[PDB]
């Protein structure tokens, strides 16, 4: 029987008032959202303290740890079975995250931002998700980047990042590959669609596949739909991704995306003979 896709629930820690204090309130609400993520069917709770999309702000390592360290401590204290991923590109944030018990590190830079992040992951058993980004900056930008063949560019990029991660001590069975979607690839939505169509081409690299459509820009369509109207598109994009080899789906709509991806897994399942 074909195994299910693992749903990665998103849990971003963004302070209400970015002044001093009031973080105890923000930690309490983050545990509430994490419990609802689990109750909707999420297999992994991805805690991140720094947004990396276009228009996002760069935050220091001290501020990043100030946001996620209380959250990880609270979740692993009351929900010790829940597997936790941490969305970070700093080696210092990853080190403290792995000490607390995080089992996965999502690096939007694919180890490029902090040269010491690869080794910190290697000295553990944590898995790492290398995502393709059109920019060296982990904070992607609004740019209608064009490609002669986006599939070859992303394939060759992830191939050399996997080699760089293996040379740092991370085995291939602990490396997860993310072709990137939306603005990370291009503000031209055609290239996110082409990557979804040829997702199975990346399985030759021998690593589990990680994708996050999650109401991104490329799901706007001809109607120029905004975020509130992208749920049908993100269900279809995530389902077709699972049909084309995606092992992880990172989304904000855990309940609906899991139920849609469950249909894709059932379509991929041959009969019981």
Ligand X SMILES: Nc1nc2ncc(COP(=O)(O)OP(=O)(O)O)nc2c(=O)[nH]1
Q: Which positions lie near a copy of itself, rule CB under 8 A?
A: 189-190, 193-194, 196-197, 219, 221-223, 225, 229, 231-233, 235-237, 239-240, 243, 256-257, 259-264, 266-272
Buried b (16+ CB within 10 A) or exposed e, 144-178: ebebeebbebbbebbeebbebbeebebeeebbbbb
Q: Which residues in 102-161 contact ligand X (CB under 6 A)?
A: 106, 108, 129, 131
> Six-digit token pair at 142?
């609004």
Binding mask 231-260 for ligand X (x = CB under 6 A): -------------------x----------
Place of tokens 């904070």: 139
**155 or 184: CB nearest Cl ion:** 155
The two structure tokens encoding residue 62:
């001290």
The listed partner (Cl ion, a copy of itself, ligand X, none) that binds 152, CB under 5 to 8 Å by sort, is Cl ion
CB of 186 to a copy of itself, least distance (A): 12
Beta partners for residue 253, in sequence order: none
Nearer to ligand X, 110 or 122 (CB): 110
Which token pair is 232? 């049908």
Backbone angles phi, psi at 168, to 5 degrees: -85, -5
Q: 131: buried, middle or exposed (CB in 10 Å: 19+, 13-18, 0-12)?
A: buried
Residue (70 or 178) nearer to ligand X, CB:
178
Question: What distance in Å separates the CA atoms of residue 30 and residue 197, rounded to the nearest whole number?
Answer: 35
Contact 211, 250 (CB under 8 A): yes
Other Cβ atoms closer than 10 A to 58: 12
Per-residue x/- mask for Cl ion, residues 95 to 134, rule CB under 5 A?
Answer: ----------------------------------------
Q: Which of 38, 212, 247, 254 binds ligand X (CB under 6 A)?
A: 212
Distance, CA of 30 to CA of 32 (rounded, Å) = 5
256 binds, among Cl ion, a copy of itself, ligand X, none (CB under 5 to 8 A by kind): a copy of itself
Sole binder of Cl ion in the list 12, 33, 147, 203 (CB under 5 A): 147
In the complex, the residues that contact ligand X under the rule CB under 6 A are 10, 12, 51-53, 87, 106, 108, 129, 131, 178, 180-181, 184, 210, 212, 214-216, 250
In the complex, the residues that contact Cl ion under the rule CB under 5 A are 147-148, 152, 155, 217
């Amino acid at each position: 029987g074909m195994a299910k896709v693992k749903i990665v629930g998103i849990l971003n820690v963004t302070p209400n008032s970015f002044h001093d204090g009031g973080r105890f309130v923000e930690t309490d609400k983050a545990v509430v959202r994490a419990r609802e993520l689990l109750s909707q069917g999420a297999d992994i709770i991805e805690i991140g303290g720094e947004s990396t999309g276009p228009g996002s702000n760069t935050i220091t390592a001290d501020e990043e740890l100030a946001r996620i360290v209380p959250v990880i401590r609270a979740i692993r204290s009351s929900l010790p079975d829940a597997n936790i991923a941490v969305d970070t590109y700093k080696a210092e944030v990853a080190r403290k995250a792995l000490e607390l018990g995080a089992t996965m590190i999502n690096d939007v830079s694919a180890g490029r931002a902090d040269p010491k992040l690869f080794g910190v992951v290697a000295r553990s058993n944590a898995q790492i998700v290398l995502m393709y980004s059109k920019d060296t900056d982990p904070h992607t930008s609004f740019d209608e980047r064009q490609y002669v063949d986006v599939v070859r560019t992303v394939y060759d990029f992830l191939a050399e990042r996997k080699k760089a991660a293996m040379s740092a001590g991370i085995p291939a069975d602990r490396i997860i590959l993310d072709t990137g979607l939306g603005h990370f690839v291009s503000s031209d939505p055609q290239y996110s669609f082409q990557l979804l169509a040829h997702l199975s081409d990346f399985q030759d690299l021998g690593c589990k596949l990680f994708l996050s459509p999650s109401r991104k820009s490329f799901l706007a369509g001809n109607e120029l739909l905004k975020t509130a109207d992208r749920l049908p598109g993100t269900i279809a994009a995530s389902a077709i991704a699972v049909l084309h080899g995606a092992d992880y789906i990172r989304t904000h709509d855990v309940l609906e995306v899991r139920r849609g991806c469950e249909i894709a897994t059932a379509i991929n399942q041959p009969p019981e003979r």
